[model samples]
Target: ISPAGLLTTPVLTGVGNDNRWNGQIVGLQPVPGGFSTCNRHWNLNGSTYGWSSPRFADIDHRRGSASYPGNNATNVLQFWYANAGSAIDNPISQVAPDGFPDMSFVPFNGPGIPAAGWVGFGAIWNSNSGAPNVTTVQAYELGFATGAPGNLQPTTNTSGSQTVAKSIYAVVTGTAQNPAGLFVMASGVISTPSANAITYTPQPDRIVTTPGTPAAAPVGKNTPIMFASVVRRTGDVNATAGSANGTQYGTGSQPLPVTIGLSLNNYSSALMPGQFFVWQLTFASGFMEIGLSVDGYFYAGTGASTTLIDLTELIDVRPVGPRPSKSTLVFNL
Candidate 1:
């Protein structure tokens, strides 16, 4: 909240369900001249071949995308992890795009969870019955075309809707409340500086907690699941210096294969019993062909933040510095 240009009130939007899997759009930055759109660039395959970009026909079955419709915004941003049945039998992992497409494809404009395993999208909707603000939100099933045509059919044909709560981090604080945690944000220029080399420097994950509850009598919980993806903001969205066309925050780029990686560990925390702890997360880009390294930073000499704002923005940052003293979970990308 103390960041110079950071908005105190973070606006959220949209909520959609793909094949019974629910997704909520949480972060929507207004592009002054209205919003433009882009197509699905590529998909990620992280089984073997170590982050290789296959031909478009290899994995162009189901696709998906996201956008921000102004005025209508929400508070909660949540995504779900669901199995895609047997629709995706191949080795597709993640969805890649410069931005959400404005239009749907010819016969099939969108998709429901591009690959098998765990695929997710942002969602935002209203949850408060006391001080109601926004009500409904829309969800899109983005599409991704592959080089192979073996599995092009969308999975889970049945269509039905369900009423869901906004936050998964729910607690019984005197009454009933939900506490939101800070997501570690990393921003930089992701570009193909050379022909075979994709250069993306992973900045320290910035822990910015969103709006949520004040006190709690502890909440039933499990280890926080971490999700990460790269979204490019083009010049048309908001112009910056040095970018040739519209790239990720000002840098000449091309539509490269979507690359994503994920990891999890089982380590408990040092927090006292009945004490509240929220998840702090960040995305570190990883690839094989390109020479890249991932690094992060944590605020030293600071305990868990009790207020809506924390020391992540206020304290002086160091690149790949020391880990926080009370870190209960460690996710290496």
Candidate 2:
């Protein structure tokens, strides 16, 4: 029970003899102007003529107008024919222009594709490709900046292998200043190899001894050995700040002057904390001809004071015992 003239389908023209048309279409819906354009210029046919429909027709005419283009009679036939020629092309698998797969447009969850010519950042310290100890050198992300000059170098040494070490000179071709010394990177240790070519050993202190028999009037002939004495306050041997002891090796008596031989052969092991060695003497003549007495107090010198003795002669004097030990007037000297 439709109203008269309300839904009549209009006859359209230019549709091809095959019952198809190649033209753009505009959909119509009833409005105050009888019909209003709803969708515009949608392709209605598969032929090249489909491109011309919108150009010729006032496709926006109101619905049911004298100029209204009907649905199945014109637009529908054109739509079907146009789509028939459009075979869906399969989606391209690789979209890059260079034939390399390009996923740059795809949003990645982790690291994204690097841009063309991108360089990663990192630091190298005290390292070189050629040095004494380095066996191998490697860097991540970037190829060695060839000849880009940096602080390290490869070198040959006494060790038969070609190794890498830190170099103060002969760096990579273009590198100007390389940060030297220690550095921490990529959870590893890097150090420069010392270039000192020669090795050194510390020499021991020198000591000398004098020649002669014990009792021979230990005088008349004096050895080049020089003597010095030192004295420590009663019990202050270890005191550092006090008027503790003097360092002169030989001086004052009471304790006697310690005789040190100057001859290179007279070497004594280095002195240690509480150990001591004694020099002995024996007599041959002068039941009282020669007498030796040690006199002098230990004196404090530049450093620490130990014990020292001064040598004094009491000539033409004699002592009491046969093998008299009294003849040995030991002067703490």
Candidate 3:
């Protein structure tokens, strides 16, 4: 509700249809009768589905919502919101060969503070149709209001084709401000024709290498990665895999083709075939907002298989390594 009176209160408005990537959504028109009208980015697995533009970046729109829509970020999900136009005016700088955000330029390390136009919310972040490094991932809900460290709903993830039941957990870090590197652990990924491993271009220290060797590629695009804050890490993980007569990857440092990650390193044995793993992940670049894949290689040799437990109909998630609680840190709404 600046001088324009567009935003009177931080009232959230759930947008049913999509804006068609046509032009403007918020501020361009009126606030549908409120100080602000924040809508969730619509999505199924891509930005054309929806990306929260007006809410999360530092770029500012020329036509003055003029901060009518408050600019802010929530600590818990480590989500950010910027007023229309207030966000940096950066667009999709790169796209993957498979129609997803190119890993070389993603987690969208770009102009926006949190990589506004670069990284998106809604359908865009759900699957590989959005970003290769983060496809088939889950998000219980899509909208986040300023100053509201809301909760993320539970997701029932379907596992990769592993034979002996196995699940791997890993500690993750970084953010749009400081993007963390990604790895495509399995040899064969879901998309692409090349039998060659999925590769990524380097960005500031994004890749690690042997003293003289070239860095390698990440695992793959639709790899089924998940994030859970540190708080969500403590649970009956090792036991869950055993429940299915499966094996789980444990605490250790396994080297990626390039970068190295600590925690829940890798799942070596059978991720019980025909079995399903339940909901979970965390500190992703916010990395419990941070949260892995690979089946063929292990399952083939070990006679093991892995399936994400179908917990869709179930009410609550199994509190696995989920994203952490918001920090209500420094904010202005």
For candidate 3, lDDT tens digit of each residue in 150-207? 2222111101100010011111210232121111221111111122212111111221
Residues 9-104, candidate 1: write the lDDT tens digits: 111112111001111212111111111111111111112111112222211212111112233334322221112221232332222211211111
What ranges in model 1 sit over 4 Å off?
1-84, 90-262, 269-274, 277-314, 317-333
Model 3, residue 68: what's the lDDT? Answer: 8
How accurate locally, in lDDT, is each candidate? 0.19, 0.15, 0.17
Where does candidate 1 have its weakest 10-residue lDDT segment? Answer: 288-297
Ranking by lDDT: 1, 3, 2
lDDT tens per residue, model 2, 1-333: 111111111211111110001111111100111100101111111111111121111111011001111332221100000011111221211111111100111111112321111011122222343121121112111110111122211111111111111111111221212322111121111111221111100000111001110111122221011121121111222322122232212111111101101111122222222211222222232111212111100111112222122222211212221122222223221
Q: Give the distance in Å from residue 287's predicted Cα in candidate 1 to where it truly belongs.
A: 35
Report how far off residue 325 is in candidate 1 (Å): 17
TM-score to native of every candidate shown: 0.20, 0.12, 0.15
- Where in model 2 is the C-alpha error above 4 Å? 1-205, 209-326, 330-333
C-alpha RMSD by candidate, in order: 21.5, 53.2, 25.5
